[PDB]
C-alpha cells in the first residue's frame, strides 16, 4: 500500500444522446474494454475508474460535481469517442477544480478500408470529436493536458501515467503540513517568503512550534525505546570506533536516537509531513538534529535547514511524486566547486542533513564529530557517497508576486579520491551544459542555495509539475544558451506578471 | 535631545546665469533672510540648512550627490527663486535618493504696483520658474511635494513642517530594527507576510531571536536592580492590595520587573527599536510580558502581539513620527462592541499590552491576575482609561503584491459606566462615519484586527506617509460612502498593481 | 593618460560572522592576494580597489553609500567568499546607483579531496553564498551581471574586463555634452527625438548654439595659427596638386583649417565631447565643415550630420568605449549598393565626414572639390579606403516611448576596383547574413540611415551596453532569420513597453 492506492483517476467518455441506445452501448463496451485493459496491463500509477457516459449537459455537470467532492478523485482523463458538443461541458468544466487530460485515442488503429461505412463513421469519430472539445478548453484558457495515440500504445501509456502522477501529487500537496521548529536564519532572504501565498497557491500549510514544545517530547522518551533504536543503528550502519560501545562518543549516539524518537513522535502525533530546524534556536536540545533528520527524510519526510519551509515542502512533494520509481530524492546544498578544464564539478552537501535514499553504499558510516555551528554537542550523522547517474536539482523561489521553479539537469559522478577528513555525506556532479553557464543562469534567475536533488524524477516530470500549478519553469540544461535564456526570463516576466 | 536633532532639511535655491551676478547676489540675500527667519520663528520639526545656489548642472548634481551621502540630510526643500531650466536638474534628480518638496514661494507678499519693472520681473519669477521645475518632476514621475504660499505664511509653515516630519520618519525607518521573540501565532494570516518585501520597500528589518536567548538575559538580572525598579513602580502607579509588600501577588510583580529589565537590556544591547512576543512560545519565562511591554512602549519602543511585526514596526514609526506633538500612540485591538441606536461604541484593548501614553489618569493601576491564554503565571499589568478626543486607528497590511494602509478616523469617548471586572486597560470610541459602515469598509479592505491607535497623529499625516512610501491609503471617515469606497478600491488596484 | 585612469572598480568581499574572526582573517588574505594578482597580471581596463569586508548590514550600506559618492567609482564587483545573508545587502542595494557584477569565483581551483574538512567548507562556500546573493538581485529585479570561473582563469578575466569597460562607459556618458550647431534637417524623422528623455535615460545632454556663435570664434582665429595647422596637414596627408601652395584650391584649404581651429576652440572652451552640424544652416561660414570634422572625430570627438545628436552621442560613447582596443570607430551612412550574385556589397560614406581612424592608408588624400548640398565654397576633405575585417554598424533610435539599439554584424572588404571619381572616403562591406535579409531586418526594425561603424567593438560589447542601460538590442547577423526576428520584435515590444 502506497499513497497512490488512496487515489483514482476517472475515465470519462464523451458522446451525445442523439445517437442510439444501442450506438452508446457500443461506445460503453469499448470504454469498459479499454479501461479494463489499461488497469490490468498499462501499469499506471493508480487505478482508472470508468464513469457513466457523458451524453447530456446535466450528466456531465453531475460527473464534474461528483469529481470535486470525491477526495480520492485526483483527476479526469476524457475520451471523446463520438462528437460531444462542447457547450454540454461548459457548466461542468466551469466548476471543475480537478485536473483534466484528453486522451485523444481511437478504437481500432488500422483503418478498415474495405468495410468502413457511415455506421462506423457515426460511432468512431474521436478525430473531430476531440478537436471540438480542445476548443472549449483553449477558449476557457483551462490547463487541459492532451495525449494522442492508440490506446494500446505503450508510449502513450507512459505519458498518461506521467500525468496521473502529477494529478496525485497536486491532491496530496493540498493536505501537506509543514512543522517549523523555530524561525528562519537571521538576515537570510531566499528562505523567507509569504506562507499565506504558498497555501493559497499550492495548498500546503506552514506553522511554527516552539523548540521547547519539541524538547518536552524528546525528554519524555523512554530509555528502553532509545536503546532499541540504537540496536537498529548498529544493524543498519557501519559504526566507527568512537560510536561503538565503550566509544568516547557513545553517549552522543544515544542522545541522537533520543532526538530522533522525540521528533518522530511529535511529527506523527501532529500529522506532519515535513519539517524544518534552525541552528540559531536549539535551546533544550543536546545537539543539532542530524542523524534523526536523515532517517526521517529516508522514511519519506520533507526537510530543509535553517527554517527553509519552501524546500522542505518541495522535498516532501517530490519524494511523494517519486513513489514506485527507481532512485533517491534529498535535501541538498551547493557546498564547493572543483575547477578543471573539461571536468568542472560541484560538491553538494549540508552541515549534517543529507538523505541516505541517494546513497550508493549499502551501509553508510555513522559518526560523531565536532560541529561549531549552533554551539552544541558533537552530533551524530550518516556519512556516505551519492549514486551515479542522471539527476535534477530543483529550487522553488518566491519572487514576491509569483513563484519560479528552477530546474538544472545534472549528472552525478564518482568521487575520484576518498574524502577521509570530510565528516559529512557528499553528492558530486557535472552541471549541464557546463559549470559557468549553469551557475550563471541559476544566479541570473535567482535560484536558492537550497535545492531538492533527485535521481528518481526528471525534467519532464517538473515541466508537468510547473504546468499543473501554473508557475514559470526555468530550465537549465545541455540546450541552454544565455542570450535565449535571458530573453525567456523577460518574456515570461510579462506573461506571468498578470 | 530628540531624534529630530539628528537630522536636517536642505534649503536649496534654484536659479540660472541669464541676468547675474548681482541678481544672484540679491537671490542669495533673500534666501539667507528667509532661511534664518524660518529657523528662528517658524518652529519646524528640524533645522533648515541653506546650501549654495543651484545655477549650473554640475552644481545641482553636486548638491544631490552630497544630499545622498549625508546621513543627517532628510530631504530637500527647493525654492525656484528665478527661472532655473529643468534639464540642469535631471542628472541630479535621477540620482537623488532623498525626498523633495517645492516651496512655491515669493520674497515679497504684495506686488509693488507703482515700482514693478523688468529688473524686479527678472529677479522674482517663481511664478514660472516653479512650473518649469514642476514639469520635470511630473515628467520623471517623481514624488515631488509642493506647497504654495508666502514664506511668512504660518499656514504654509505648518504644511512645510508637516512634510519635514515625514522626511525625518522615512530616514529613521531605514534604520528601524524589529526583534521577534518567537514566530507568528499559528494559523493566523494578517500578521504574516514577506519580511524581505518590507525591508526592500520601507527599509526596516525583521529577524527572530529564540525566546531562550531572552530568558538567559532575564535570568542574569541582579536582585538589586529588580528591587530598584519595583520602587519606581510604587512611586509611579496606584498599587492594588494584592500587589503591595505582603500581597499574595507581590512575587508576580518582582518577576514582571525582572522580565522588563531583561527585555530592556536585550533590546538596548541589540540596538532594537521594536519587538514582538508570542503567547504560544514562552518557554523559560514565568509569565507573558505585560507590564514590561507597556512601559517599554511608553519609553518609545514599537510592539505588537503574537509576532505581528508589521504593526510593531508601524507603532515605532508613528511614535517617532509624533515627536513633539501632544501625545498618545499605542498598540490596539478591537475587543468588543456596544450596539445602541445613536451610540454605537467600540471597546479597544489587548490581553495585556496597552500603552499608558494614551492614559488619562496620571496614575494607572498596577494589578496582577489570571491569564489563561499562554498558560503561565498571573502577569502584572497597568489598568487605565483612555483620553478623550479625535484619534486615528491605522493598519498596514500586506496584499501579497503590495502594501495597503488603512486609516479610520475615530473619536474616543468617556466610558458611561465603570468596568470593575475588566483586568485590562481600555479605549472606547465612536468609529466614523458610523459603526456598521466603518467596520464594513474596514473588513472589505482587509484591515487587520491589530492597529496603531493615536491621538497625536491625524489623517493628513498618514496621507503624506502613504505618498512618501508610494502605497495605497484607504480612508474611512465621515465622508465615506460604500459605493464610492468600493470604486476607489478597484481603481487603485489596477494603478498600484502596475 | 586615458579616461580609464580617472575611474576604478571596487572589489567588495561578501561574508558574515558565523565562524570568524580567523576565518575572516583568511578571507581577507585571499581577497588581497586575488585583487593584487588581478591588478598586476589580468590587464583589466582600470584598477580594482579592494574594500573592507562586508559582514554586517551597516558595513554593506556604508560601502554602497561611499560607492555612490565617489565619482571615480564606476561599479562594484562582488565576491561572496562565504555565505553572506542577502537581507544585509538590501538597504545598500536599494540606494546603490552604480552597476554591480558578481564574480562567482573560488580561491582554490582544484578541490583538495584528501584534506577537505568542515573548516574548508565553512571558509570556501561561494558555491551557495553566491546563490543567496543572486536571489536578492533577481528578487529586486536589479541588473546584476554574473561571471563564473576561477580567479586565475584568463577567459573569466576577459569577461570581467569587458564588463568593467561598460561600467566606465556608463559613468562617462553621464557627463557627455553634445553641442548642436543648428537644428535637424527639415522634414527628417529618425534624427529627431526627445532630448529630455535621452538625458533622463543616458545622462548625456544636448543643447543648441547658434551657427553665429561659432562663426564669431572661427573669425577670431589668428593667421599664424591657421598657417601652423596647414603645415601639419602637409606633413600628415598626401596633398593633391589643387591643394598645394600655388594650387587653385589652396585658399579653400586655409579656410578649412580656420574652421577646424574655431570649432576646436569652441568645443574645448565649452567642455563639449560631441557635436553636430546642419548644411541647411551655414550662415557666416565659408564652407560645410569637412576636413575639420574628420580630424576632430579622429581626436575622439563624437559627430553626426544634419543635427543628428543621437548618433553623435553614440559615436563618442563607442569611441570612449573602445579605448585601448585595436581601433577604428566612425560616423557612417549607407550610400549605395552593389548587387551581384554571391557578392552583394554595401558602399558606406558621407557627403564629407568620415573618420580616418578606420583608414588603411597611412596617408589619406586631402582634396578639395565641389559640393552642391549647402550651397557653399568647395570644402576640403580627407579621401581614403577603409581597413579590412569584422566590424559592426550600430544605430540608436527613439521609438517615442523607448530606445532601440540596432546592431548589424558586417565584414569590410577591399574594393575590387578603384573609385577615381568619388571625392569622398569609402567603406565597403558584406552585411551578415546577406544583403537582402540584413537590409530588410534593419528596415523592419526602423534603424536609421546614420550609424556608428566600428572595427574595435563587437556584438558582445553592444549586448552588454544594452543590458547596462536596460534597452532592447536588435541583433542582425549570420544567425538571423526573419520569422524568428519578427517574433522577438513583438515579444520585446510588450516587455519593454511595460
Ligand atoms: O532664462 C529666463 C527665461 O528666458 C525667462 O524667464 C523666460 O520668460 C521664461 O520663459
Ligand atoms: O487565539 C485568540 C487570539 O490569540 C486572541 O483573541 C488575540 O487577542 C487576537 O489578537
Ligand atoms: O551562515 C552560514 C550558513 O548557516 C551555512 O553556510 C548554511 O549551510 C547555508 O545554508
Ligand atoms: O537631402 C538629402 C540628405 O541631406 C543627404 O542624402 C544626407 O546624406 C542623408 O543623411
Ligand atoms: Mn543550508
Ligand atoms: Mn492580539
Ligand atoms: Mn547624413
From Swiss-Prot, chains A, B, C:
Pathway(s) this gene product operates in, as recorded in its UniProt entry: Carbohydrate degradation; L-arabinose degradation via L-ribulose; D-xylulose 5-phosphate from L-arabinose (bacterial route): step 1/3
Subunit structure comment from the entry: Homohexamer.
Database matches in NCBIfam families: PRK02929.1
The protein, known as: L-arabinose isomerase
Binding annotation for Mn(2+): 306, 333, 350, 450
Gene name of this polypeptide: araA
UniProt keyword terms in alphabetical order: Arabinose catabolism, Carbohydrate metabolism, Isomerase, Manganese, Metal-binding
Cofactor note: Binds 1 Mn(2+) ion per subunit.
Catalytic activity, EC: 5.3.1.4
Family annotation (PANTHER family): L-ARABINOSE ISOMERASE (PTHR38464:SF1)
Originating organism: Escherichia coli (strain K12)
Family: Belongs to the arabinose isomerase family.
Keyword Acetylation: no
GO molecular function: L-arabinose isomerase activity; manganese ion binding
Enzyme type, top EC level: isomerase
Amino acid at each position: 500500500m502506497t499513497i497512490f492506492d488512496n487515489y483514482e483517476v476517472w475515465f470519462v467518455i464523451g458522446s451525445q444522446h442523439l445517437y442510439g441506445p444501442e450506438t452508446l452501448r457500443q461506445v460503453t463496451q469499448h470504454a469498459e474494454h479499454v479501461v479494463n485493459a489499461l488497469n490490468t496491463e498499462a501499469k499506471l500509477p493508480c487505478k482508472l475508474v470508468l464513469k457513466p457516459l457523458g451524453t447530456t449537459p446535466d450528466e456531465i455537470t453531475a460527473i464534474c460535481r461528483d469529481a470535486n467532492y470525491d477526495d480520492r478523485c485526483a483527476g479526469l482523463v476524457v475520451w471523446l469517442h463520438t462528437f460531444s458538443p462542447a457547450k454540454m461541458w461548459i457548466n461542468g468544466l466551469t466548476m471543475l477544480n480537478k485536473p483534466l487530460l484528453q486522451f485523444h485515442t481511437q478504437f481500432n488503429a488500422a483503418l478498415p478500408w474495405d468495410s468502413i461505412d457511415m455506421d462506423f463513421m457515426n460511432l468512431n469519430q474521436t478525430a473531430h470529436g476531440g478537436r471540438e472539445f480542445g476548443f472549449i478548453g483553449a477558449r476557457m484558457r483551462q490547463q487541459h493536458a492532451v495525449v494522442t495515440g492508440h490506446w494500446q500504445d505503450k508510449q502513450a501509456h507512459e505519458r498518461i501515467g506521467s500525468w496521473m502522477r502529477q494529478a496525485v501529487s497536486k491532491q496530496d500537496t493540498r493536505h501537506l503540513k509543514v512543522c517549523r521548529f523555530g524561525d528562519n536564519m537571521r538576515e537570510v532572504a531566499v528562505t523567507d517568503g509569504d506562507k499565506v501565498a504558498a497555501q493559497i497557491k499550492f495548498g500546503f500549510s506552514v506553522n511554527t512550534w516552539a523548540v521547547g514544545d519539541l524538547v518536552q517530547v524528546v525528554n519524555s522518551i523512554s530509555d528502553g525505546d532509545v536503546n532499541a533504536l540504537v540496536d537498529e543503528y548498529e544493524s543498519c550502519y557501519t559504526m566507527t570506533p568512537a560510536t561503538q560501545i565503550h566509544g568516547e562518543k557513545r553517549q552522543n549516539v544515544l542522545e541522537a536516537a533520543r532526538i530522533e524518537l522525540g521528533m518522530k513522535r511529535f511529527l506523527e502525533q501532529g500529522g506532519f509531513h515535513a519539517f524544518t530546524t534552525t541552528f540559531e534556536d536549539l535551546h533544550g536540545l543536546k545537539q543539532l538534529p542530524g542523524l534523526a533528520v536523515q532517517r526521517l527524510m529516508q522514511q519519506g519526510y520533507g526537510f530543509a535547514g535553517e527554517g527553509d519551509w519552501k524546500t522542505a515542502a518541495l522535498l516532501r512533494i517530490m519524494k511523494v511524486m517519486s513513489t514506485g520509481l527507481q532512485g533517491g530524492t534529498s535535501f541538498m546544498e551547493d557546498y564547493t566547486y572543483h575547477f578543471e578544464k573539461g571536468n568542472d564539478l560541484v560538491l553538494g552537501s549540508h552541515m549534517l542533513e543529507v538523505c541516505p535514499s541517494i546513497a550508493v553504499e549499502e551501509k553508510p558510516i555513522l559518526d560523531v564529530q565536532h560541529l561549531g555551528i549552533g554551539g552544541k554537542d558533537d552530533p551524530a550523522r550518516l556519512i556516505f557517497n551519492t549514486q551515479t547517474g542522471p539527476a535534477i536539482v530543483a529550487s522553488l523561489i518566491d519572487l514576491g508576486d509569483r513563484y519560479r521553479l528552477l530546474v538544472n539537469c545534472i549528472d552525478t559522478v564518482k568521487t575520484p579520491h576518498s574524502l577521509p577528513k570530510l565528516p559529512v555525506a557528499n553528492a558530486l556532479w557535472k552541471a549541464q551544459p557546463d559549470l559557468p553557464t549553469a551557475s550563471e543562469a541559476w544566479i541570473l534567475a535567482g535560484g536558492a542555495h537550497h535545492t531538492v536533488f533527485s535521481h528518481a524524477l526528471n525534467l519532464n516530470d517538473m515541466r508537468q509539475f510547473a504546468e499543473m500549478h501554473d508557475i514559470e519553469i526555468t530550465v537549465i540544461d545541455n540546450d541552454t544558451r544565455l542570450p535565449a535564456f535571458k530573453d525567456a526570463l523577460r518574456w515570461n516576466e510579462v506573461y506571468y506578471g498578470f
